[PDB]
Design a protein around this ligand. Structure first.
Ligand SMILES: CCCCCCCCCCCCCCCCCC(=O)OCC(COC(=O)CCCCCCCCCCCCCCCCC)OC(=O)CCCCCCCCCCCCCCCCC
Ligand SMILES: CCCCCCCCCCCCCCCCCC(=O)OCC(COC(=O)CCCCCCCCCCCCCCCCC)OC(=O)CCCCCCCCCCCCCCCCC
Ligand SMILES: CCCCCCCCCCCCCCCCCC(=O)OCC(COC(=O)CCCCCCCCCCCCCCCCC)OC(=O)CCCCCCCCCCCCCCCCC
Ligand code: HEA
Ligand code: HEA
Ligand SMILES: CCCCC/C=C\C/C=C\C/C=C\C/C=C\CCCC(=O)O[C@H](COC(=O)CCCCCCCCCCCCCCCCC)COP(=O)(O)OCCN
Ligand SMILES: CCCCC/C=C/C/C=C\CCCCCCCC(=O)O[C@H](COC(=O)CCCCCCCCCCCCCCC)COP(=O)(O)OCC[N+](C)(C)C
Ligand SMILES: CCCCCC/C=C\CCCCCCCCCC(=O)O[C@H](COC(=O)CCCCCCCCCCCCCCC)COP(=O)(O)OC[C@@H](O)CO
Ligand SMILES: CCCCCCCCCCO[C@@H]1OC(CO)[C@@H](O[C@H]2O[C@@H](CO)[C@@H](O)[C@H](O)[C@@H]2O)[C@H](O)[C@H]1O
Ligand SMILES: CCCCCCCCCCO[C@H]1O[C@H](CO)[C@@H](O[C@H]2O[C@@H](CO)[C@@H](O)[C@H](O)[C@@H]2O)[C@@H](O)[C@H]1O
Ligand SMILES: C[C@H](CCC(=O)O)[C@H]1CC[C@@H]2[C@H]3[C@H](O)C[C@@H]4C[C@@H](O)CC[C@]4(C)[C@@H]3C[C@@H](O)[C@@]21C
Ligand SMILES: C[C@H](CCC(=O)O)[C@H]1CC[C@H]2[C@@H]3[C@H](O)C[C@@H]4C[C@H](O)CC[C@]4(C)[C@H]3C[C@H](O)[C@]12C
Ligand SMILES: C[C@H](CCC(=O)O)[C@H]1CC[C@H]2[C@@H]3[C@H](O)C[C@@H]4C[C@H](O)CC[C@]4(C)[C@H]3C[C@H](O)[C@]12C
Ligand code: CUA
Ligand SMILES: [Cu+2]
Ligand SMILES: [Mg+2]
Ligand code: NA
Ligand SMILES: [Zn+2]
Lengths: 58, 49, 49, 514, 227, 73, 46, 43, 144, 105, 84
């Protein structure tokens, strides 16, 4: 392996106004959208489950 | 120059106190609330056995 | 030192005082701590060339 | 921009605001629950149902008031807002982790609400003692949702504690020693240390209850060689420190309020105040068994716990007399905040004193699990903690919002609340001495008068809570913008204006070492 | 039992409860003195136009307000601990009775000689005989001999409960898998009431305790006839 | 056309505090003496008086004749 | 960057005092009402 | 503390409105549930 | 005279008993007449008229000690309004007793209480001080 | 600490410094009123004179107001101090708060 | 553990003096209180000439060779029993 930290330093210090979590590129965007979708979708689903468990099924 | 308190202070105090006493006395004696006071000096013991 | 016109100064008047005296120090003539009178003078900017 | 600011925040002020909002909402829930309790006890007989629905209400009232109202407001709200400003720091040490401590609360609250929605709720008491809280006497998801709620609130507070201790130790100006930081900052650090040490034990204990309920472990089940009393030790080892965690930030705010409205540049006996809070924090870890005087412990163990418990009166006494000594010779400003602080000093003292009565294991035999205990803790919590929160809220509201409240309305609010809480809890001393048990949905006829008066007092408090919402509305509706504040030389948090800008102390303060 | 508008403790029925009443009077006086002293001082600090806002020295007055409370705490602890140890004194009972807590009633066992045992349920309000106390009466009372040292053993067969009789100064938790001991000694004959003192579910408020203290002779006959 | 005499000008706050702290102490003593008579002593005498010539059998007989007992009719 | 100053450092708007009163009413009202409706929920199950 | 005059003064009439609306938002929903308590208890 | 929001970093004026001499003068900008008065002030004060002296004072300070220390009628409004709200609370309690609370247990009826009271006296409830001690068993009535 | 005479002397000296500036005048009075005492006429004398040297009449009157305030309920201290300062008030042309109608609310 | 207090910004002389007078000495004062309370001479037990106690395989190099170095007549019996 070779030291490529300088390349990464250049990329992450590039004045493009992007927040650190999206500054790596398009992949950051995708991973973020996947994470957030699972979180919010999963939360809606948990609310639905609460609604189901709240009532007796005799 | 007179403020809210100089103009309305006496009235707020007078009618506030009057309203308070009136409604609390009504609630305490005219609506069927059971205070369950001590029988001492007020109840005449009656045979139970 | 300051990179602007004014900077907050905290003055611990005597060693071991638990109370710190805070005040804005403005560009211009030296100002004095409201508690002990020691003088402070703002010497503005730079840092980044 | 809205989402980035309010959902993705890394700003101590905004995060403190979120906490204040969350705590205010929780306070409404907790107040409603307290009204249901007092409605049920307002007249002899049954109103809602048996002890199950009643105790689900009692249990939730406690969890909401403690975990969702008091802690978030004092530590998350005032702590986040004021700590960085008081030490001239640009923000908290871990601004991103700080945001997670906040966001763990809504989910935690949702789990608590879920537990009362499913099955028959968790009517176990906030102490959640097994076997009543076990899988046979409380079968179903309710108790499990309650344990999970506590886990999330626990993680939130532990991470919050790590953040506060780090910020306070590492981010003061280079010249400022720990003995040059304001008392409120001291109160928060000590509280954070108590949280860091106590919550993990609670977590261990409720995890064991969880496994006993779902993985067939038997930590608290005698059939497997377990012991229900083990749970009590684990719970109370956290439980006592918890009550000091609830009052310490309050003591800190009281010191600031009393000093400020006495027109003083400093509180009387600063080092004695630091010593007192540290002692209280320390002693608070070696007295837990005073919550177990009737479980059947050896007499020597009981003599020790009686003795250790009473010692705390000494450091607490130094604080009370120091607050009075701060008022001494002051140019007293009779503001609404001062009123809350004066009420706190007196009412907290009364509550502390009845605590000393309860410390005596001999007497506690008769007072335990009766309304004498309920009277004690509501004087220190519903009057102590709450008055400190109200005082701090009216004092700092102009700083956080940039607007002033109407002082007359605020003084009216104080008067109503003062009458309400005293009418509610004072009679409970009589009910306790005479033997009325805790957690009862109905009581023998002889207890009717005091229960009736207590429930009426609770309605007066409700009127005060409703008035407070109106008062806050009126402030935001009228928009009277703050101009000047007195005593900024000894109250750094006000030095950047009202409200301070999003980023404060970008250029740190200048403090000579000499 | 408690009577309407009661302010303090139920009248003492045992020598130990009498002891607690005097200890509480002692403690309460201190509570009143300290709380009124604090209220007084607050008013004193707030009623003067005179001022002194400069730095005030504290290492002098703090000796006073550290030593004084320390002394007061010792003055409370002494009689408190004397009573504590007194309750633990070896007394050697003449009778041992056991009580098991259940959801939601108490069962009793007098098994010194015969194997006597029975359940004790609260009399439903709809079923009270005229003059009987709501929520406090039970079908089978705990008949016990007066002026005698009795050993009560408490436990439970399900969740936690707590066996209490305020007039006797008693409260002993009923824990499953554990046998807690307490001693009972009534100075007088009569009926003495108490209520479950540990949250145990649905009917926690409705599982009272009623002691019936009678002379030894009657205790014995009762024993026999309850076989 | 008379002059005014030099009034005390120093330590007026402290002087006030001392006077009232001493008065508070006097009142505490007076309260202690009152309480240890209207409550403490009263309680000791009430119990001592009640049990001095107390007859437990006579008391029981009265209760039995009134029919309060389940085991003694 | 974000808006700063009185009425701008909060997640809700105070531009209109009546719209604000509606917000606050829903906010605090929903909190206070929740326990009553949960109690109603528990009573209507059995 | 010194402050500027209200930017949008709230007159006594306005305050009565805010107070009443505030009180009603708390009282109405709870009052409704409490009123129908018996209808809930057995149904 | 007129203060602004962004002036929080600048010394300000305050009327306080324990800070008699504020950091700034009440009025900093002076008219033709006012600047003339400050010049007159450099000469003997005896040559100053009462009205000139009071003008000098009002340039320097906002309120005098007597004005800043005046008491008010605010307490009337506070106490009166508190009582109005506590009174309003009684209305809520009236509403509750009427629409929420059902009848109380039959054990509270006058006859029941009379019997229950005799029974409590028969079992000698609180004979030392609390209850039965208040009944004269000889004269068969409540001790006078 | 120190004797009453030494404290007084120290404050008389402070206000008697010829070139005392406005800041030092305010600092001295604002500090002095923090103590548990009504300053001696001799200290007030020196401070009033400093006001003269600073051409500050308004502060001279404020100083007399603070002296009356510091006495609190003891209505006999101000009349006596004003008595003792009469020569100086006359000399410098200092009208008391009363004479200016500054004592009416 | 982490105790229950705080400082740590810089543990120096002032902090250790704070601990000496605010924690350490008060603890010694409490233990001194407790000790000079639970004291009082507890009644000495009946003498039993146990063979594993009051050992004498060689006389002591002091006194009469039969008394231990810090012999207390009140509580230390000789091999033959308590002293007069
Ligand atoms: C609301 C219901 C009131 C019912 C009143 C009694 C009726 C008696 C009939 C008829 C009376 C005579 C016949 C019966 C005698 C029974 C004696 C008994 O068995 O004796 C024991 C009993 C009865 O004790 C008494 O002997 C009653 C004492 C009442 C003290 C009241 C202070 C009240 C202040 C303001 C009003 C209350 C609300 C605010 C309270 C605020 C906190 C105190 O039980 C207690 O121990 C209850 C108190 C528990 C401890 C609280 C400690 C700190 C309290 C106050 C410090 C205030 C200092 C400044 C001075 C006070 C400043 C405000
Ligand atoms: C639950 C919330 C309901 C909200 C309903 C209304 C929504 C309208 C939307 C929209 C109509 C368009 C309006 C745009 C601007 C205003 C509204 C907005 O979107 O704003 C949204 C904001 C603000 O909320 C508002 O919108 C109402 C604000 C009322 C403000 C009162 C201020 C009170 C005084 C002092 C406060 C502290 C600071 C003081 C000093 C000054 C600041 C430092 O919230 C936040 O982003 C996060 C707040 C977190 C803390 C709140 C409670 C979390 C509660 C429960 C967990 C529940 C578990 C399940 C429980 C489930 C149910 C049983
Ligand atoms: C030398 C010794 C003898 C001295 C004799 C007096 C001499 C005085 C000289 C000199 C004394 C100082 C004089 C100057 C003070 C400033 C006067 C002014 O320019 O400013 C105007 C100020 C003046 O303030 C005052 O001035 C009176 C203040 C009263 C404050 C009470 C605060 C209580 C806080 C905590 C309570 C527990 C501890 C209490 C401690 C209380 C200490 C006073 O503001 C008010 O007028 C508004 C507030 C009034 C209502 C207060 C709350 C009531 C709470 C609970 C009961 C509700 C009853 C109604 C509803 C009832 C429903 C049933
Ligand atoms: C902080 C804790 C807290 C607070 C404030 C209160 C407040 C109140 N509590 Fe308490 N309560 C507990 C904690 C608390 N309680 C606990 C721990 C238990 C034991 C539970 C158990 O046994 O398991 C309990 C139990 C309990 C019982 C005994 C139940 C039983 O044994 O059967 C009763 C009975 O009356 C009661 C009543 C009340 C009432 C009427 C109030 C009223 O005073 C409430 C009035 C309203 C307020 C004081 C809230 C105001 C605050 C805000 C709304 C925030 C405002 C926002 C900002 C300023 C930003 N409570
Ligand atoms: C804010 C919360 C808070 C605080 C600060 C305290 C403080 C104290 N508490 Fe309290 N306590 C609770 C909340 C709190 N408590 C709760 C929630 C419960 C019930 C939990 C449950 O079961 O659900 C409880 C229960 C409880 C018990 C258990 C009773 C039982 O269940 O049978 C005991 C036992 O000793 C006790 C003691 C004390 C003591 C001695 C203090 C001391 O810290 C107080 C010290 C203060 C003073 C003494 C006053 C000021 C001092 C002076 C003016 C100096 C002079 C004084 C003397 C010389 C005495 N508390
Ligand atoms: C006050 C607390 C401090 C303790 C020491 C102070 C005074 C004693 C004198 C020297 C002690 C030094 C080291 C300890 C050696 C032997 C144990 C002594 C501990 C002691 O002092 O024990 C006493 C016995 O005294 C005895 O025989 C002691 C007889 C004295 C003779 C000493 C014998 C010397 C032997 C030393 C061996 C040296 C080898 C060391 C080598 C080091 C490494 C090469 C106990 O008294 P007692 O009456 O039996 O019981 C009390 C009943 N009321
Ligand atoms: C169980 C309950 C226990 C009960 C509590 C008992 C309370 C204690 C009662 C009295 C304390 C007596 C302290 C005596 C101090 C003298 C006060 C004084 O006068 O205050 C200052 C001393 O400084 C100083 O100690 C600093 C100022 C004063 C320091 C002490 C004041 C605080 C006193 C407490 C305030 C009341 C709270 C009481 C708490 C219950 C004044 O300074 P000097 O005169 O040198 O300078 C003035 C210049 N000269 C020289 C020209 C006059
Ligand atoms: C029933 C099941 C319950 C489950 C509950 C689960 C709760 C949360 C789960 C998800 C949380 C994981 C996400 C990662 C968290 C990492 C926090 C972290 O790593 O935080 C760091 C600080 O804490 C530090 O160092 C040191 C501290 C490191 C803390 C690591 C976080 C772990 C969270 C769990 C804690 C459990 C408590 C343990 C005791 C029982 C970094 O601070 P930031 O503010 O980010 O940045 C500051 C910048 O200057 C960095 O350049
Ligand atoms: C502890 C917190 C609670 C405090 C107490 C609440 C104070 C009173 C609130 C009033 O609320 C209501 O009052 C009613 C009666 O006055 C109801 O009307 C109801 O009753 C009727 C009239 O009798 C009918 O017209 C309608 O059908 C109706 O449902 C009603 O729904 C409810 O909103
Ligand atoms: C590694 C470090 C250790 C090094 C060795 C330690 C040395 C210990 C020295 C002990 O010496 C002693 O010896 C004695 C014995 O002779 C004592 O006197 C005594 O002994 C007597 C002689 O018979 C009697 O006359 C007296 O009563 C008296 O108690 C005696 O007080 C003591 O000083
Ligand atoms: C490639 C690298 C040399 C430094 C470099 O990258 O330029 C070498 C040096 C030491 C490392 C090795 C270390 O010797 C430890 C390991 C030993 C081997 O048994 C397996 C791989 C092993 C896990 C490592 C893999 C190897 O690729 C490393 C990473
Ligand atoms: C309560 C706890 C046991 C918890 C458990 O059973 O799991 C025990 C463990 C050690 C005990 C302590 C130690 O045994 C030392 C002390 C012994 C004394 O007899 C009483 C206090 C004393 C300080 C004890 C109090 C209490 O009984 C402790 C703290
Ligand atoms: C030494 C330390 C800090 C002093 C300083 O560096 O400023 C001070 C602060 C608080 C003091 C303590 C508190 O004042 C409480 C106690 C008061 C008694 O007068 C002596 C012991 C007492 C326990 C004090 C000992 C010591 O003087 C402490 C601990
Ligand atoms: Cu059995 Cu509670
Ligand atoms: Cu505790
Ligand atoms: Mg219990
Ligand atoms: Na009920
Ligand atoms: Zn300084």
């Amino acid at each position: 392996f070779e030291n490529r930290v300088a390349e990464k330093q250049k990329l992450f210090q590039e004045d493009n106004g992007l927040p650190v979590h999206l500054k790596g590129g398009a992949t950051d965007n995708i991973l973020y959208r996947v994470t957030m979708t699972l979180c919010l979708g999963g939360t809606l689903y948990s609310l639905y489950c609460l609604g189901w468990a709240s009532f007796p099924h005799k | 120059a007179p403020d809210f308190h100089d103009k309305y202070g006496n009235a707020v105090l007078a009618s506030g106190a009057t309203f308070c006493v009136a409604v609390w006395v009504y609630m305490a004696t005219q609506i069927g609330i059971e205070w369950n006071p001590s029988p001492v000096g007020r109840v005449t013991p009656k045979e139970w056995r | 030192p300051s990179i602007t016109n004014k900077r907050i100064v905290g003055c611990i008047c005597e060693e071991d005082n638990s109370t710190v005296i805070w005040f804005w120090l403005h560009k211009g003539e030296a100002q004095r701590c409201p508690s002990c009178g020691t003088h402070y003078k703002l010497v503005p900017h730079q840092l980044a060339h | 921009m809205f989402i980035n600011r309010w959902l993705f925040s890394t700003n101590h002020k905004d995060i403190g605001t979120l906490y204040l909002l969350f705590g205010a909402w929780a306070g409404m829930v907790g107040t409603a629950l307290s009204l249901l309790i007092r409605a049920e006890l307002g007249q002899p007989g049954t109103l809602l149902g048996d002890d199950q629905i009643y105790n689900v209400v009692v249990t939730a009232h406690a969890f909401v008031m403690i975990f969702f109202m008091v802690m978030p407001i004092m530590i998350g709200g005032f702590g986040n807002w004021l700590v960085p400003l008081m030490i001239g720091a640009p923000d908290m040490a871990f601004p991103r982790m700080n945001n997670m401590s906040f966001w763990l609360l809504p989910p935690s609250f949702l789990l608590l609400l879920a537990s009362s929605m499913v099955e028959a709720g968790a009517g176990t008491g906030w102490t959640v003692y097994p076997p009543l809280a076990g899988n046979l006497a409380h079968a179903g998801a309710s108790v499990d949702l309650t344990i999970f709620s506590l886990h999330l609130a626990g993680v939130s507070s532990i991470l919050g504690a790590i953040n506060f201790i780090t910020t306070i130790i590492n981010m003061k100006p280079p010249a400022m020693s720990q003995y040059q930081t304001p008392l409120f900052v001291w109160s928060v650090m000590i509280t954070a240390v108590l949280l860091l040490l106590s919550l993990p034990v609670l977590a261990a204990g409720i995890t064991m209850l969880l496994t006993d309920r779902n993985l067939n472990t038997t930590f608290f089940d005698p059939a497997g060689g377990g012991d229900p009393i083990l749970y009590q030790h684990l719970f109370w080892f956290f439980g006592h420190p918890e009550v000091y965690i609830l009052i310490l930030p309050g003591f800190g705010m009281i010191s600031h309020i009393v000093t400020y409205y006495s027109g003083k540049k400093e509180p009387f006996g600063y080092m004695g105040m630091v010593w007192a809070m540290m002692s209280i924090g320390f002693l608070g870890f070696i007295v837990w068994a005073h919550h177990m005087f009737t479980v059947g412990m050896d007499v020597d163990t009981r003599a020790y716990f009686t003795s250790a418990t009473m010692i705390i009166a000494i450091p607490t006494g130094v604080k009370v007399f120091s607050w009075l000594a701060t008022l001494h010779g002051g140019n007293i400003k009779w503001s609404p905040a001062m009123m809350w602080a004066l009420g706190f000093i007196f009412l907290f003292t009364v509550g502390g004193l009845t605590g000393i009565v309860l410390a005596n294991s001999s007497l506690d035999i008769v007072l335990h699990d009766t309304y004498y205990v309920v009277a004690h803790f509501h004087y220190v919590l519903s009057m102590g903690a709450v008055f400190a929160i109200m005082g701090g809220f009216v004092h700092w509201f102009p700083l956080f919002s940039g607007y002033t409240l109407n002082d007359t309305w605020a003084k009216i609010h104080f008067a109503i609340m003062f009458v309400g809480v005293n009418m509610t809890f004072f009679p409970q001393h009589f009910l306790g001495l005479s033997g009325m048990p805790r957690r009862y949905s109905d009581y023998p006829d002889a207890y009717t008068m005091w229960n009736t008066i207590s429930s009426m007092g609770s309605f007066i408090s409700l009127t005060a809570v409703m008035l407070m919402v109106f008062i806050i509305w009126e402030a935001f509706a009228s928009k009277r913008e703050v101009l000047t504040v007195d005593l900024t030389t000894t109250n750094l948090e006000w030095l950047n204006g009202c409200p301070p800008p999003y980023h404060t102390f970008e250029e740190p303060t200048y403090v000579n070492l000499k | 039992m408690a009577y309407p508008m009661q302010l303090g403790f139920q009248d003492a029925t045992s020598p130990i409860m009498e002891e607690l009443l005097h200890f509480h009077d002692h403690t309460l006086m201190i509570v009143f003195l300290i709380s009124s002293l604090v209220l007084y001082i607050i008013s004193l600090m707030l009623t003067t136009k005179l001022t002194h806002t400069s730095t005030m020295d504290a290492q002098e007055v703090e000796t006073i307000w550290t030593i004084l409370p320390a002394i007061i705490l010792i003055l409370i602890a002494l009689p408190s601990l004397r009573i504590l140890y007194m309750m633990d004194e070896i007394n050697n009972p003449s009778l041992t009775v056991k009580t098991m807590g259940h959801q939601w009633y108490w069962s009793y066992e007098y098994t010194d000689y015969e194997d006597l045992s029975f359940d004790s349920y609260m009399i439903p309000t709809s079923e009270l005989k005229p003059g009987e106390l709501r929520l406090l009466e039970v079908d089978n009372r705990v008949v016990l001999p007066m002026e005698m040292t009795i050993r009560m053993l408490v436990s439970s067969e399900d969740v936690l409960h707590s066996w209490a009789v305020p007039s006797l100064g008693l409260k002993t938790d009923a824990i499953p898998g554990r046998l807690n001991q307490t001693t009972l000694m009534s100075s007088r004959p009569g009926l003495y009431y108490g209520q479950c003192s540990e949250i145990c579910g649905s009917n926690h408020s409705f599982m009272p305790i009623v002691l019936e203290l009678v002379p030894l002779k009657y205790f014995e006959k009762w024993s026999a006839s309850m076989l | 056309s008379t002059a005014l005499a030099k009034p005390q000008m120093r330590g007026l706050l402290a002087r006030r505090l001392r006077f009232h702290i001493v008065g508070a102490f006097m009142v505490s003593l007076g309260f202690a003496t009152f309480y240890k008579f209207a409550v403490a002593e009263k309680r000791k005498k009430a119990y001592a008086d009640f049990y001095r010539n107390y007859d437990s059998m006579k008391d029981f007989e009265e209760m039995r004749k009134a029919g309060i007992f389940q085991s003694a009719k | 960057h974000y808006e700063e100053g009185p009425g701008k450092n909060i997640p809700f708007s105070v531009e209109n005092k009546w719209r604000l009163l509606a917000m606050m009413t829903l906010f605090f009202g929903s909190g206070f009402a929740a326990p009553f409706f949960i109690v109603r929920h528990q009573l209507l199950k059995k | 503390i010194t402050a500027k005059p209200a930017k949008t003064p709230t007159s006594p009439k306005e305050q009565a409105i805010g107070l009443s609306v505030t009180f009603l938002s708390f009282l109405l929903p709870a009052g409704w549930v409490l009123y129908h308590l018996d209808n809930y208890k057995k149904s | 005279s007129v203060v602004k929001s962004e002036d929080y970093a600048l010394p300000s004026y305050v009327d306080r008993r324990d800070y008699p001499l504020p950091d700034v003068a009440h009025v900093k900008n002076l008219s033709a007449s006012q600047k003339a008065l400050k010049e007159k002030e450099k000469a003997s004060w005896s040559s100053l008229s009462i009205d000139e002296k009071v003008e000098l004072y009002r340039l320097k300070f906002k309120e005098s000690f007597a004005e800043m220390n005046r008491s008010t009628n605010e307490w009337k409004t506070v106490v009166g309004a508190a009582m109005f709200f506590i009174g309003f609370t009684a209305l809520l309690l009236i509403w509750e007793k009427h629409y929420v609370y059902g009848p109380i247990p039959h054990t509270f009826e006058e006859e029941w209480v009379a019997k229950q009271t005799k029974r409590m006296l028969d079992m000698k409830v609180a004979p030392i001080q609390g209850f039965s001690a208040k009944w004269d068993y000889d004269k068969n009535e409540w001790k006078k | 600490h120190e004797t009453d005479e030494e404290f007084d002397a120290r404050w008389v000296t402070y206000f008697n410094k010829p070139d005392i500036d406005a800041w030092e005048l305010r600092k001295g009075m604002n500090t002095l009123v923090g103590y548990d005492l009504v300053p001696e006429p001799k200290i007030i004398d020196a401070a009033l004179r400093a006001c003269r040297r600073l051409n500050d009449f308004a502060s001279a009157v404020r100083i007399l107001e603070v002296v009356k305030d510091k006495a609190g309920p003891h209505k006999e201290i101000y009349p006596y101090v004003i008595q003792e300062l009469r020569p100086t008030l006359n000399e410098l042309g200092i009208s008391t708060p009363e004479e200016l109608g500054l004592d009416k609310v | 553990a982490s105790a229950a207090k705080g400082d740590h910004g810089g543990t120096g002389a002032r902090t250790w003096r704070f601990l000496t007078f605010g924690l350490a000495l008060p603890s010694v004062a409490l233990c001194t209180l407790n000790s000079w309370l639970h004291s009082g001479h507890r009644e000495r037990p009946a003498f039993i000439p146990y063979h594993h106690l009051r050992i004498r395989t060689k006389p002591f190099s002091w006194g009469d060779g039969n008394h231990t170095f810090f012999h207390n007549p009140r509580v230390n019996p000789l091999p033959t029993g308590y002293e007069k």
